[PDB]
Amino acid sequence: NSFSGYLKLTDNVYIKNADIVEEAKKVKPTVVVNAANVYLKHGGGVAGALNKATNNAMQVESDDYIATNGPLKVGGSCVLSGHNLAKHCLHVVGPNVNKGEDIQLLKSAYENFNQHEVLLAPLLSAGIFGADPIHSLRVCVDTVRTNVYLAVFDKNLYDKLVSSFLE
């Protein structure tokens, strides 16, 4: 968990302008969070990038999990192997507001992080999931009580988030 170059926002929330895939390779954290969907189909975005970095081993493991346990619920999670990226991957489903899912489930989604002492994570429900990224950061700060290192792969969004938080 040798995270470097993060800006500490609160006692337990740190943030960096970085690609989560590159952070996972450098740090090899105990837990990396995936921004998953309920069927664990890692077809693009953050989930697609993490799967590609495991040379599709994450997708094969995920399909086997789904066959045995069924889909996740929005706001839920499951712990699977981290493969070459981390000891474990915590697949968390945040709401996709562009598909009509309830923004209130973003609190339930971040609550899953509290079962792990230290995590490397993306900003849940941001990008094409349609949530307001400044609201996502506020929910993270208000809900996560363990140590979370957020990697946001966009300098423009990183600067807006830091400015909004320090207001």
Ligand X SMILES: CNC(=O)c1cc2c(N[C@H](c3ccc4c(c3)S(=O)(=O)CCC4)C(C)C)ncnc2[nH]1
Choose which of 123, 139, 140, 148 interacts with ligand X (CB under 6 A). 123
Q: Which of 81, 86, 110, 76 is nearest to 20 (CA)?
A: 86
Piece in contact with ligand X (CB under 6 A), picked from 3-11, 65-73, 80-88, 119-127:
119-127
User: CA 107 → CA 113, 125, 148, distances in Å?
Assistant: 11, 11, 15
Choose which of 3, 38, 103, 127 interacts with ligand X (CB under 6 A). 127
Q: Shortest approach of ligand X to residue 137 CB, angstroms?
A: 11
Instruction: Show the tokens assigned to 159.
Output: 């600067």
Decide if residue 105 touches ligand X (CB under 6 A). Answer: no
User: CA 37 → CA 42, 47, 96, distances in Å?
Assistant: 8, 9, 9
**CA gap 108, 110 in Å, rounded:** 6
Q: Give buried/exposed letters for 110-129 (b at 16+ CB in 10 A, else e).
A: bbbbeebebbbbbbbbbbeb
Piece in contact with ligand X (CB under 6 A), picked from 14-22, 57-65, 80-88, 103-111:
14-22
Piece in contact with ligand X (CB under 6 A), picked from 61-69, 70-78, 139-147, 153-161:
153-161
Q: Shortest approach of ligand X to residue 75 CB, angstroms?
A: 14
Choose which of 29, 75, 82, 122 interacts with ligand X (CB under 6 A). 122
Q: Which residues bind ligand X (CB under 6 A)?
A: 19-21, 35, 45-46, 49, 122-123, 125-129, 151-154, 157
